[PDB]
Amino acid sequence: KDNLLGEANSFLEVLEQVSHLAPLDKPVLIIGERGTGKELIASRLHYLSSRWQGPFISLNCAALNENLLDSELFGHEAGAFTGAQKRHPGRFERADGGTLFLDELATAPMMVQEKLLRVIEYGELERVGGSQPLQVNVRLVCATNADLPAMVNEGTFRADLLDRLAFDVVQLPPLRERESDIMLMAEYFAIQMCREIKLPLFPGFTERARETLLNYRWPGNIRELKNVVERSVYRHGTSDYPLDDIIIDPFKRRP
Amino acid sequence: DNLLGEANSFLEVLEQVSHLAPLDKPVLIIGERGTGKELIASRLHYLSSRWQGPFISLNCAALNENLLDSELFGHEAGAFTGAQKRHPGRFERADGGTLFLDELATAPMMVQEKLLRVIEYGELERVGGSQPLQVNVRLVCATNADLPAMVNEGTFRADLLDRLAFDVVQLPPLRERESDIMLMAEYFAIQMCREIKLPLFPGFTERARETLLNYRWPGNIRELKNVVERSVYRHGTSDYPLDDIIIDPFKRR
Amino acid sequence: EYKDNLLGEANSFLEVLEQVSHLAPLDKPVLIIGERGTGKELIASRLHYLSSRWQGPFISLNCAALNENLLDSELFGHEAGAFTGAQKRHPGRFERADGGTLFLDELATAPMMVQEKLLRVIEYGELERVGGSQPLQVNVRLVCATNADLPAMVNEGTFRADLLDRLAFDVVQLPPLRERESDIMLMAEYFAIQMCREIKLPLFPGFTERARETLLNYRWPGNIRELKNVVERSVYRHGTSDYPLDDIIIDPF
Amino acid sequence: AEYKDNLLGEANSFLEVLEQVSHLAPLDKPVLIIGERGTGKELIASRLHYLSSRWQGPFISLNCAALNENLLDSELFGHEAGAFTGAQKRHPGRFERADGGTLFLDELATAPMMVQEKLLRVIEYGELERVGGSQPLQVNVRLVCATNADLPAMVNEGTFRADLLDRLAFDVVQLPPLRERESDIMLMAEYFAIQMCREIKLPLFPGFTERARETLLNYRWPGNIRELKNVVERSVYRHGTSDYPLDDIIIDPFKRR
Amino acid sequence: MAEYKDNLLGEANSFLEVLEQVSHLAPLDKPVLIIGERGTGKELIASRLHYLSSRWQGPFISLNCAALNENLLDSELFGHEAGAFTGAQKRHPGRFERADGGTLFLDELATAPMMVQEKLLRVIEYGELERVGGSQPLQVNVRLVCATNADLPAMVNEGTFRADLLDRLAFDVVQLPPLRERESDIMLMAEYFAIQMCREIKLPLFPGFTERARETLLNYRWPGNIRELKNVVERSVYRHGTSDYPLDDIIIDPFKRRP
Amino acid sequence: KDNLLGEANSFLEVLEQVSHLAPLDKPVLIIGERGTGKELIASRLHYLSSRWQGPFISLNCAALNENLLDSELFGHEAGAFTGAQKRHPGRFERADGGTLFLDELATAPMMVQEKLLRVIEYGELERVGGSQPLQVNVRLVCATNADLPAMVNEGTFRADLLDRLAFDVVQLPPLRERESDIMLMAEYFAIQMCREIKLPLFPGFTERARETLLNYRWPGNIRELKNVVERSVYRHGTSDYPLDDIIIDPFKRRP
Amino acid sequence: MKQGLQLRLSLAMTPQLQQAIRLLQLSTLELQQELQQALESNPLLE
Ligand SMILES: Nc1ncnc2c1ncn2[C@@H]1O[C@H](COP(=O)(O)OP(=O)(O)O)[C@@H](O)[C@H]1O
Ligand SMILES: Nc1ncnc2c1ncn2[C@@H]1O[C@H](COP(=O)(O)OP(=O)(O)O)[C@@H](O)[C@H]1O
Ligand SMILES: Nc1ncnc2c1ncn2[C@@H]1O[C@H](COP(=O)(O)OP(=O)(O)O)[C@@H](O)[C@H]1O
Ligand SMILES: Nc1ncnc2c1ncn2[C@@H]1O[C@H](COP(=O)(O)OP(=O)(O)O)[C@@H](O)[C@H]1O
Ligand SMILES: Nc1ncnc2c1ncn2[C@@H]1O[C@H](COP(=O)(O)OP(=O)(O)O)[C@@H](O)[C@H]1O
Ligand SMILES: [Mg+2]
Ligand SMILES: [Mg+2]
Ligand SMILES: [Mg+2]
Ligand SMILES: [Mg+2]
């Protein structure tokens, strides 16, 4: 499919579950830490999914405000629209039969929440008069980094609607918990950045870098992975000289 | 199966609802979190003489355009630019038949007073066409009980709702329903297997059935459907009986 | 003739109605200390029908909780200025009724700012438009009704006591359900007749003294409307002119 | 031009105040009213507006307190184009009201210290506090004030800054307290009683019962703008004694019988 | 050029030296910053600077933060160019655009939005700003004027004042001698104000003031240093009349209820 | 290129770090104290980047309008509409490669935070009524007088808000920290300030005052040093005046 | 709430209505009479 970061037993099982869900057009949930890219994984699995070649929706959550699905997802394609009349494309109508991914869906308001709840209850929220229904055939996807478990417990979203929006919630475990893909990512990023930073060679994570990583809590995980990647890009040293002090923390004050 | 089997008490309530369906009286309805009080309404509407008439059910208080309550009856376009006003409206769409409300829960106190007054007196007038209100054919309200109003008083303007005592319908819990719950689950499973094009029903351990029965069913049959979906996807095979049923997709391993 | 709606056998109700007739012949301000259900909007109709100018349009129906922006717009508007919700000149204005009179309800909800604007209009009708010079006045009497103990509200300084004084050329206490008890059975009979005719029931097949005692024991926190629509639900429970309603449930709650 | 209003004000101090107003008539500086709510503060204000106006002189008796909205008072500061939902349309507004006149404020405390200081920057200078070409309109405008709040109390609130209270103040008029005047109270009371007996077209004036007159004098009536007239209409409700003279004073309108 | 000060409020104690320094700063093009009691010579100082505008044609433009519209005055802050906010039409000059090269007669209005403070700091960084919706800004010039009444350092310490505010502000401090402090021309400026009051009131001649009057004047701090004294004097022009007025001090505190 | 030189070992280190980062178009921020010439530093860097001859125009977060927020980074179509106007490029298009620094970044709202999180993508710009996104990736940089670690401690700065920055934070020495070129920096500041003052050349400059000034917090390090210098220059206003007992302590009352 | 000139906002007679209203702008007695003669159609119009 695509070049992938992480082939661990957990990562491999994730790939297997992705294959299982790929036929499953029923909406599901892939949970994980941000700065990893589970959305890209969803895109690859969608290429493997029912829509082997189909549409795709990015749909960052807080990209629409005071803009209903009717404003953007449904659109104003027909005549007699607001202002002077013309054609206007709509997302949720545009990408039927493809992929419908919701980015940072945990970042959500109550009103859009009530909208999407009915959209799920009816297949799509539809437009205008209450006599008009709709359904969307795109592969519905969504993800964020928040444990909604308490958000619904706090009522930030409708708990029943939360239950409705998916059919199988899956959570990506911490890469820091893995801490084995540490070396694999280090090497892959070393090659990629040697191609990028145009270095003579990859310095290689010397003993101190490995020890620090072993001690590192790595809160950002894949986010912290790219963070350490940039950090070592700062701490290049020499292409020959293996990087023992590879990490570079911006917050710290040297000397 | 695709219809509302319903428990015995639920069956009696269903008979009462199918009877009240011919009664086109304005109503306010209450169903559980995942009970699905809408399908019974559709069955009643078919049983109602309003079966032939339009039955536009409220679109979850959707907020398209700025017409809002004038969305109930508005204009399409000025003749000079676009099309004729063409008398299209929301309160008009449910014409000759039922009229169902949805997401009545979300409203604040002011719009609550507005709805109470509309119940007291309703008129429909639009820049585009429109037609007189005070008919509200086979009117019925629903989804208000999701967010109670004036439960300890206050909240929304439900003092008039206390005054406005048109009949209402409760919603027993799925755990309290005691219907053919396993049968409904099996029906859903068969429907999914057809949808999934599955080889067959792999089966279910009666021990697994009893263990899954250890659940409040907070989403009622909706919770049942979600748990069944998760359990089957975990099974992912038609080979052996489902000794596992999904408690919650939120977990760790 | 105003239909003598809810003709109150209560003597205090009769005195209140006599005062209502006297003041309605007058064209002077007045207050009504009454509750929703306790004469909900009925006295407004009494004033409109017995208005000092019967031809003078008394729209009444001011039990209107409108948002601060919404209420202020309901008072005043601007042509081709601001006012995103409406368009161009705002005919929507308290001057909508000239020749008749002007009333208020849910008046406890009036902000001190809105209350001040109202008192200013009461003393002198001017500046009733968001746009332009509004010295013009539409002649109309003043009346209102809210259920709050507005003496405490002013003791709380909740709104302008200026209107509270100026408008209150007569504050009329109005009867809740607990006030009228002798007329309770008669009003129940009147409502039952109205329902049977409306429900096409020939009549109530029979009334049990137990039924009357139970209904009287069942209080009416909403003085009329709660009792009225409770009777609606109870008749729906009975539904048969042949079947007497001895214990027809008033309300689901 | 316009005569000051007729008002039964037999209080000799009230007469002195009227004389003070007479002195202020040609004068062009701010005036305050420290009159009570229900002390005819607006009434004396109108008398003043007529007298000092003295040549078809415009007045303005408006309360931004009635202007319930912030954007409302913002519009009261004129805008030429893009004014709220409006776009490129004229709106003279309150500026025209004060054009060739003065400003009379009834209980101006409700104004925010932001609004207060807006008015402060307007007062001494006068150039147009409005979105307009160079906003240079320092119109020939005076001002006058009326509120029941206390100056130290306002300082505690701080809603009136130092220069606010000061460049606000050039004259002050505390209306005679409703508790202060006793004889003039019954005097204006009889005046209004006659006014009612006339306007109501009642063929007979009931007059005034001695017990009723004594009760009215004992009645605090700290509000007496028309709360006196209100109690007058209260007894007029107990009409039918037009030939008679029987006491009927409505103390608690909420209370019945 | 050299113009007669339209006012003659001078307090010889230090406002003489203050005026000397102000004249020194008058040719300068750096930020003009002032501080002191409102109703006390400070807006008068603003007049002083505005006349003290080197050469002429400098637009003595004054905009007061309290005299504005929250969430809306921004359209007039850096300018307006496009439709849907300035009523379409043309590039609508904002308060800043209304004064290019002219005086930024700001006073420390201490408006609630520190956002306003930053927006001004955005204007006051390098002489550059943009009308609303303009894809191209405009780097401009204008005289800059500030006047205050409160301890900006305290509020910044209290976090109430944007440190950046006083930072982009305050080319230097300009405080004022209080009426409890200046006390130089009490009788002299009193005579000047009384002369104006007589020229208005058309009384026959100067009524005169007793020594007890000046005694109470010394006893008074005069909270509105330049103004509250003028209030006393103006009220003195009222009440009793003619030349007989002399003793019995004067009418200083209108707020003071009559004895 | 014609800005104040720090003339410090830390200042030299910062200059070298900027020189190293000159080709790097990766996202960045100015940590430390804005209003101490972080603006000038970023500007001179924009002059000397890999795209030295490129269109660079910085921007401040707190500038635009909440309603016009969508019109901030971009432009709306509004063809036959109320705000009818031509296809407008807008900011994220208006820069297109150069340095548009994220100033006032500490002064942002959570809604603007969502906007930036959308901007975390290299272009892919969806406008109002737009058909297809456009990828406008540019040399990216910001400024932060605040401690984003403490900000995420308060949480108002999202973890993604921190993630947007793609550079390890270079920090400059505060007033107490730097205190290196204080005499020389004061000398240059006096040169400029007296060139403004047009007074005769200062015959008096006593370094004992400079020493006592070193015994001061100088919270406005870059600004207030020269500020008090020029303020004392104006207050003294004398050429033959030694740097003795002269100080701009506006908080202090004169005696 | 408050109002603003910028918002999602929801006309002017064109061609046919222009000549129509011009018939009103033209005098009905004679100026419109020439056009009415020029009609020469809509036989269902006596
Ligand atoms: N398996 C992987 N292979 C390559 N890159 C990856 C992998 N997982 C994550 N990434 C990197 O992590 C980033 C995650 O981006 P994205 O999915 O947009 O985050 P979010 O979903 O929080 O917006 C991607 O830019 C990608 O380069
Ligand atoms: N007795 C029943 N007969 C048929 N379908 C049912 C029954 N109970 C539950 N359902 C299903 O449960 C789902 C609940 O969906 P929804 O209407 O959103 O629930 P609610 O009305 O509680 O919000 C419905 O789609 C419906 O198909
Ligand atoms: N001389 C008078 N005789 C009778 N009534 C008077 C007289 N002067 C004033 N009033 C009454 O006092 C009422 C309140 O006046 P006023 O106190 O000026 O109002 P405001 O509260 O605006 O100051 C008016 O309605 C008026 O009828
Ligand atoms: N030294 C003075 N001599 C005479 N009059 C003065 C003097 N100082 C102030 N005034 C009076 O104060 C008024 C100016 O008020 P001012 O202090 O400028 O208001 P603000 O404080 O709002 O700028 C003038 O009318 C003037 O008569
Ligand atoms: N290293 C330095 N040497 C001499 N003068 C300096 C130095 N740094 C700053 N300055 C002076 O102080 C001022 C600092 O402002 P600036 O650095 O532009 O603020 P910012 O960069 O934070 O916007 C400049 O105008 C400059 O004249
Ligand atoms: Mg993403
Ligand atoms: Mg539902
Ligand atoms: Mg008044
Ligand atoms: Mg001033």
Numbering used by the authors:
A (entry chain 2), F (entry chain 3): 5 to 259
B (entry chain 1): 6 to 258
C (entry chain 6): 3 to 255
D (entry chain 5): 2 to 258
E (entry chain 4): 1 to 259
G (entry chain M): 1 to 10, 13 to 48
Would you copy out the relevant sentences from the publication that reported this structure?
Bacteria use sigma (σ) factors to recruit RNA polymerase (RNAP) to promoter regions of genes that need to be transcribed, with 60% bacteria containing at least one specialized σ factor, σ54, responsible for transcribing many stress response genes. The σ54-mediated transcription initiation requires specific AAA+ proteins (ATPases Associated with diverse cellular Activities) known as bacterial enhancer-binding proteins (bEBPs). DNA looping enables bEBP hexamers to engage and actively remodel the RNAP-σ54-DNA closed complex to convert it into an open complex. In this work we capture intermediate states of bEBPs in facilitating DNA opening and partial unfolding of σ54, and therefore link the ATPase activity to DNA opening and σ54 remodeling, which eventually lead to transcription activation.
To understand the structural basis and how DNA is stabilized in these complexes, we determined the structures of PspF1-275-RNAP-σ54-DNA containing mismatches between −11 and −8 [RPi(−11/−8)] and between −10 and −1 [RPi(−10/−1)]. Interestingly, DNA with a partially opened bubble between −11 and −8 did not support transcription, suggesting that this complex is unable to proceed further to an open complex. In the RPi(−11/−8), we observe multiple structural conformations, at varying degrees of tilt of PspF1-275 hexamer ring relative to RNAP-σ54 and varying degrees of RNAP clamp opening We also observe significant degrees of promoter DNA bending, demonstrating the wide degree of conformational flexibility in the complex. The DNA density downstream of −10 was generally poorly resolved, indicating that this region was highly flexible. However, one conformation has sufficiently high resolution to allow us to resolve the DNA. In these complexes, we observe a previously unreported interaction between PspF and σ54 RpoN domain. This interaction is only possible with the tilted ring conformation, suggesting this interaction contributes to the stabilization of this ring conformation in both RPi(−11/−8) and RPi(−10/−1), giving rise to the higher-resolution reconstruction of these conformations. Significantly, we observe the σ54 N terminus is further shifted along the PspF hexamer in RPi(−11/−8) and RPi(−10/−1) compared to that of RPi(−12/−11). This would thus support the mechanistic model in which we proposed that ATP hydrolysis and the conformational changes within the hexamer lead to translocation of the σ54 N terminus; and RPi(−11/−8) and RPi(−10/−1) are further along the transcription initiation pathway. Second, PspF1-275 hexamer ring tilts, as observed in RPi(−11/−8) and RPi(−10/−1) structures, altering interactions between PspF1-275 and DNA, which could contribute to or stabilize DNA melting.
